[PDB]
C-alpha cells in the first residue's frame, strides 16, 4: 500500500513533471526516472523538515529537477 | 535543565494504548447539520 | 458567472452588428448591470439554419458569449430586448451557473453541501469546459512554463 | 514510537542528499546497503529460518550535513549460534547497534534510548528466569518499515532498460558475437555483482582495459570474471570518480552559459553539432560580446553550432567554432539584413510544427491508429502539414474502423500493406479515394461472408 | 526530574529509577515478582493481589494496591 | 546559480539567528537586543520592498517564528522596537503563512506590560496576519491577564502605603476584570475551542 499524504504528493509531482518532461523538455527517451523522482521526493521532505511553504517546496524540487533532466 | 533519571525496565504492551473531544465534535457537528433532513 | 447567453446572430456588415452588441450594452449598463465579458466566436455553419423575421433561411451565423452580472428584473428586461431584437436569431439564457446541475434534482442529501461562491467566482470557461481546455492547461499557469518550454523545438528544427 | 527518530536519521545521512562529494555519497550507498542487509538478516532471524550473517563485527560509517561523520561499530557475542536461545541477545544487540548510530546522530532523545535499553534488560532478565504472558513495532519492525516504504534506494537498472538508454555502447572491431558474449551471459547473472554507485557510468566495450576515453564512460573488453571486474573498480576508484565529477561540471558550465545566452539574447535554446571543447570558446566569446549582440539585431532566434557558415530555411543561424573577435564584426554585418527574414521563417516555422502537431495528436485521438511518422521524410513543413490536415480531414470517416495494427507514414509513393502493418501516403493524397478504397475492402469482405453462407 | 519525566514521555512512575526509597521498593517487588513468574505490570499485580486475598491479607493486598497505584501503574 | 546561492546564505540566515537565540539571556539589556535585530533585518534585506523572487526570508521556515518573538518586549524610551516587530509581521502577512498557537503563547509570555500588548495586537492587526482561532483566543486571555497584574501592582501600591486594603481592593480580589473574554465566573468558555480543555495558566 501507500500513505494518502505521499499518495496526493506523488501525483501532484507526477502531473507536474509529467508536463515539464513531456511538452516542455520533448524528451521521451529519458532514462531511470525514478532517481530524479525520488530525489524530488527527498528534497521534499527536506525542505519539510524546516516547514518553508507547500506551494514554494514544490517549484524548487521543480527548478532541480529541471536542472537535473538538463544535466 | 536537569538530567532525566534512568528508566530501569520498560514493556512494549505498555505503549500499546483529545480523542473523545473529537470524537464529540463530529457528533456535534452531525447533530447540527448532518443529520438532518 | 451570474448570467450567460449564447446570441447567435445573423452575419450582416460590421456596422449592423457592431450597432447592436453596443445597444445591447447600453442596455445591460443603463439597468445597472456589469459585462463580465463579451467575446466572438466567428461565423460557424450550424446544423441548423434560422429563420429571420422576412423568413429567410440562413446558412452562416455568428456565434457570441456574453457574461453578465444584473439584477434578476433588469435581467429580464435585457432578456426581453435580445429576444426581440431584429439581428439575434437565437439566444439561450444560462440559469444554471451559481448551482451545478443535477444538484436539485439529483440526491437530496447533496443538495446544501455545495458552495456557491466556488462557481461564483470564476468565469464561464471554468465552468463548461471546451474540448481544447483541460487541467494540464490550467496546471501550466502556475508552474513558471515560460523556463520550460523553450526546448520544445529543440528536436525539430534539425528535422 | 521510533517513527519520526528513524525518519530525521533517514533524512540526516541519506546519500541523495550528498551531490557535492561523490566519495562520501557512495560510501552512504555501501552504509546503507550493509543496514539494509543487516536488518534483512535480523528479519530472518526473527521469522524462524537462521542464516550465517555476511559480517559478524563491523565498523559501519555515515555522513552528516550540518545544515561531520558518524562512525558506529556492530559487534556480536562470541558464543553465537544459530539454536533458538540466540534468537533473542542478537535482537537486543542490533537494537544496541540502531540506537547506536542513533544516539552519535543527535537526533533522538535519550529517554527514548534509556526506554530501548529498559526493553533490552527486561528481554535480558526474562530470558534466563521463564515467565508466561497471554501492539507497537520496535526499533527494528520500524526500521525495515521506514527503510522500505519511504527511504529505500532507487533499484538497479536493468539490461532492456539500458539497450534503448543509449548508455551500453560497443566498438564493433572485435565481433558482433564478442559483444554478444560479452552482454549476454556477462549482465544478466552478472549484474547482481555490479554496484549501485557504478549504474550512473555508461559501458563501452573496446580493446584495452581502461576508465574512459569518452567524457564519463567506462571501457571493459573480451568475456571477463566478475571477480576481475571487482578488483579492476577496487583499483581505480578515484579515476572514475573524478571522471563523472568532471563530466558532471562540463554539463553544468555548458548549461550556464545557455541559460545566460537564453535569457539575455531572448532566445529559445542554443544548438550544437560539433564537438564541445570548441563550441565552449564560440560560447564564451559570444558572452564576452553578448552587448555587440545586444546592440544589432540578433534576438529571438535559435543559434545552431555547426563547422560551415550557413542558414537554415526553418529561421535557425549555423555559427562556426572556429572563430576570433576581428572576424566577428564582418560576419554580423554580413548577415544583418538576413535577420529578420530568419525571424519571420522562424516565427513561421514554429506556428506550422504547432499546426502539425495539433492536427497529428487529432488523428490520434479521433481513429487510434498503430502510430504516425510524417517526420521521416526530408521534405518541406508546407507537405508535413498538408498530410496532417489531408489525415485530419479523412479522421471522422475512417472511424468505424480501427487502425491499431496499421502505421500511417509519409512516403514518397503510394504503399498499402495489409499482411504488414504500413499504410505509407504522399503529401498530396485524395483522402475521398482512400474512404472509396476501404469501402471497396469493406465491400469485399461482406460479399465473401455473403458467398460463404450461400455456399453452406 | 521524574514527575515531569512520568507526564510526557507516558512513562509510570514505578518504571523510572531516580534512587529513591519508593523506587528501591519498585525494584524490590519487581525482583519478587520476577520469581514467582509474573512481569510486575497491570496484569501481574492482580495476580499477586488476588494470591494474597484468597489467603486472608486483606491489609497487605490493599498496600500493595495503594503503593502500586501511587507508583503510576 | 540563482536558488542555490539564495539558500546558501539562507542556511547561514537560520544559523545566525539561532546563535543569539540560544543565548535566551533574561539578563542581557534589551537595548542590546533590539539593536542585533534590527541589524539582521538590514543585512537580508528583510524589508517587504525587497524584490520576492531573491526573497531570503521564505527559506528560514521555523526560524521565522523564533526572530518573530525576539524582539519582545521593545524599548518602551525610544519608541523603535515596533519597527522590528512591523518589518517582520508585514513580511509575514504578505507571505501567508499562519502563526501557530505555541508562538503566539509564547510571543505574549514576553510582553511585560499592558501597553506593550496592545501594541502587538494592533500591529499584527495593521499587517494582516492570519492565525487559528486557538491563536485568537490565548491571545486574548494574555490581555486579560496582563490586566489583572497591571491593577494587582496599583492595589499593592496603596496597600504599602496606608498598611491596610480598601473595600476597592478587596472587591478586586472576588470579582476582577468585568469585560472579558474568558472570565473566571463561567469556566466552560475554552472547552470547544482549545483541544487541551483546558485555559493555559501562565506563572511568573
Redesign the interface.
Known sequence: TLSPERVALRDELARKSRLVASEGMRYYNIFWVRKPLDTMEKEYYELKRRGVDHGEAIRKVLQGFYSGLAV | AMEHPAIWLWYPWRMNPHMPQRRALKNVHGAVFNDLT | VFYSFVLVMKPRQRRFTSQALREIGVAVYSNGGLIRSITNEGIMRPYSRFRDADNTPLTYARYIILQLDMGEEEMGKVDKIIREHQDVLMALKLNNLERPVGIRSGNKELQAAYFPLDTFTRLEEEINWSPQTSADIYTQLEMNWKEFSRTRWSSFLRN | ?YKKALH?FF?KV?P??FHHNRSQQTVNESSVARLNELLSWAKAFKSGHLQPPPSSSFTLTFYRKP?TIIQSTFELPSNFAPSDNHRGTVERAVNKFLRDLLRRAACID??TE??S???D??AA??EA?????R??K?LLDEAVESMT??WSL??A?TLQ??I????ILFSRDLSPLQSAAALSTLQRHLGELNYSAW?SMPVIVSNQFSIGDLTGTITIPWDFTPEQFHSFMAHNEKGVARCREVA?QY??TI??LIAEL?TALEL??I?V?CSHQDALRLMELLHRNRELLIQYGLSKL?L?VGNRHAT?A???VIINCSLTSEQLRPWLKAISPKLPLQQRLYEL??QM?ESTLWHLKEFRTMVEPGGVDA?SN?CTYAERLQWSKELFRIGPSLAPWDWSEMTFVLSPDVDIDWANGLLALPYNFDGDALVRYVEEVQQEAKSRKREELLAA | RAEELSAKYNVPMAYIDDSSEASNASKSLALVMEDVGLEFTEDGLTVVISALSRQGYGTIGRAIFDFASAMGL | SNAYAAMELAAEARREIHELWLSAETALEREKRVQQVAALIEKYKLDPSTPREADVSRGLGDAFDRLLLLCLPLGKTDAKGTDNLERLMHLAGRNGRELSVRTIQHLFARTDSFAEALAVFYTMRRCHVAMNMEAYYSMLYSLQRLEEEGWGQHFRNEYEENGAPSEQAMDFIVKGISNALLPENKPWLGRVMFQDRNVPDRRY
Do not use: W, Y
Not at chain 4, 528466569?129 to 504472558?133: G, I, V
Not at chain 4, 534503448?164 to 548508455?167: F, G, H, K
Open positions: 514510537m530525521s533524512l541519506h541523495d542528499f545544515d535519550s529517554v534509556s526506554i535499553e529498559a526493553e534488560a527486561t532478565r526474562a528466569k521463564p515467565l508466561r504472558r501492539g507497537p520496535s516504504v519511504q532507487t533499484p537498472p532498460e539500458l534503448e538508454a543509449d548508455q549504474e558532471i554539463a553544468s548549461e550556464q537564453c529559445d535554446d544548438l553539432s535559435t545552431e537554415r526553418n529561421g535557425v516555422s514554429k510544427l517526420f526530408d
